Design a protein around this ligand. Sequence first.
Ligand SMILES: O=P(O)(O)OC[C@H]1O[C@@H](O)[C@H](O)[C@@H](O)[C@@H]1O
Ligand SMILES: O=P(O)(O)OC[C@H]1O[C@@H](O)[C@H](O)[C@@H](O)[C@@H]1O
Lengths: 275, 275, 87, 87
Amino acid sequence: KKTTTVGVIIPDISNIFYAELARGIEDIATMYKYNIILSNSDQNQDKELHLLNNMLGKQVDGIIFMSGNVTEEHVEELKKSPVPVVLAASIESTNQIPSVTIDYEQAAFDAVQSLIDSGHKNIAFVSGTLEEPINHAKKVKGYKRALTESGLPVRDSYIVEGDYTYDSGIEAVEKLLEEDEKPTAIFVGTDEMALGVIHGAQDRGLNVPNDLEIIGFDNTRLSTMVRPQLTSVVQPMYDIGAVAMRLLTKYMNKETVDSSIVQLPHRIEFRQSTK
Amino acid sequence: KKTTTVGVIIPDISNIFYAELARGIEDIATMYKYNIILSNSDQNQDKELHLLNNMLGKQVDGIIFMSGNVTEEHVEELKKSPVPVVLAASIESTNQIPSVTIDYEQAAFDAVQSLIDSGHKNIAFVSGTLEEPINHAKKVKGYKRALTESGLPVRDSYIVEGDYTYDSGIEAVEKLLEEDEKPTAIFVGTDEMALGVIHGAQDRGLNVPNDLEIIGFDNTRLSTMVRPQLTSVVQPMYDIGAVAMRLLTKYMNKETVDSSIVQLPHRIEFRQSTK
Amino acid sequence: AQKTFTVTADSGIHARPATTLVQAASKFDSDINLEFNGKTVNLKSIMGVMSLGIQKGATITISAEGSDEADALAALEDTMSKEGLGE
Amino acid sequence: AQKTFTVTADSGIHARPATTLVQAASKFDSDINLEFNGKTVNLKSIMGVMSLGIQKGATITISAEGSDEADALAALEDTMSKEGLGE
Ligand SMILES: O=P(O)(O)OC[C@H]1O[C@@H](O)[C@H](O)[C@@H](O)[C@@H]1O
Ligand SMILES: O=P(O)(O)OC[C@H]1O[C@@H](O)[C@H](O)[C@@H](O)[C@@H]1O
């Protein structure tokens, strides 16, 4: 009936972002004597839904699911699952499915607010795929809210979407630099794109942070592998995977659960891309 | 008797290097309807040997093993395994255990040779943990052989070991720059360290590649996320994992195997860290 | 019964885009091969295709021999550009 | 029955070094807790310890109450520096 092995569905294990979450999950599974069956979905809803059956059809004591877009259809099938399912670094509005993340909306806001407190009025936002709820529902809103609350304009041409790749980061700054009212600060929704934003601007000759201040998100290892060193919002990738696994072992072993909706603390690591 | 799930032992899934190999393995396993049970060992021989039993004790149709140091004791237990075992990006002198890699020694040599062909006489080598055979048995030897064959001195103070971290890359250049006869070119055994070598030198004010040319190894995504863009020896991480898995499915399904010792082609991607 | 291309992918024919080109040829009946630098391999084989190490700028010729030649060759030409490999 | 430290780890008490500090306290019988910013949690709990988000430079106080207090507290002080967390 029970195998002591949990299945984990992930968009792409080769991405440092997901690879970090996987290490946390794996470590805790090990700690609590569980085995993991990892499977890449590549953000393909069809693949994702299919992989769900597979894991269940191989009877696993649990499921940790990660995805950039947990749709109503996903939620429906996840509620049907015979075993405990915990979402990691992913969100669905109803909160019916257990999940571990950070307060994205609040973190985006704090990020932009620090740029405003620094005297910035023209602040842009280079975002990842706008379709994904963490982006349009949270990060974007946190960015906009910081603007409005300080009584600043909320221009849509100041928001350009990338695709998480370092190159899109480059293409984003150039597009933003084509604007008449040049931004003086840029909040990027991901470290890899922020590196592209930093480089794309240094290739255009501007200096970071003198001509343009920048802030990234996740605080991956890339943040320290840039010059200047990237100021970045901290999302504890490992902790998220670790805690999401622990939460899962609580459901699996029927322990006392305080809340199935967990938001780990976030902060900002100020480095050199900001003044 | 058979589960159609192979076990993979890996030092650390969060490292981009191993995460890349894992994606290739996973993709091919999927293609051939297999499941994977990933487990981190952290280069701990005790952990590694233990994890071997675990996988076998859970009856898996195969095992893909990765490690920086496959010792005689490891080989002994691997030969004892009831199921096909293929080594990925790892080596053991006897060639008794199937493996997929590249010709490390030849690749290090080609790397240094191009620096010599470019007019360099004082060439250093920033290496990873010297204890690991790929380093002292291959990369180092390829580096030395390129030197001797061109009738150049083989100074040991020109070889400093890092620990694969970006910081060790920084510490390595500074140590190398303390040398009386400053190197004009540096071959780094890993992309992450090469970034640290590039930055550590730009922080010391020198210019790459004018004052110092640099070449890395692996050609990860970091190579293009630096300025200048890193010239790097190409090791197809994904292909290595993919092919190592395919080779494994050949043994598992008893297909025709041409050779259990595979060395995929390597080349050098010349970018900006070289002239 | 065949088409020739110039690989545009900066990564050449490797990694996932190579697993994709293999997957595609495998969905046919004909006998699809890859001709490169005077070496021909089975385009339905991961090891074979990845053992060639086809870099960017190289010239390759995919061949098809079977009851669905044109279909394979045409679908692959579509995969070639769909995957940004070449044309 | 307790010791106080200043976290030196630039990453603070997180990730593996946090899983290690948890693992360590868990190897005892006493009741080990972590005191931070006026909040105490069970040092043997992953969620508890990671829900505090202890950054670098913070001051924490690990406490022990059991038949092996000094042993736990001493072993943890050793883990504290062995892991570069603080002292
Ligand atoms: O690790 P980095 O480069 O900051 O990238 C993280 C991002 O990587 C993307 O692939 C994910 O879709 C995002 O959700 C994630 O935040
Ligand atoms: O991906 P990068 O930064 O080039 O690092 C690769 C290296 O990472 C190290 O951790 C491994 O021990 C090496 O064997 C590997 O070559």
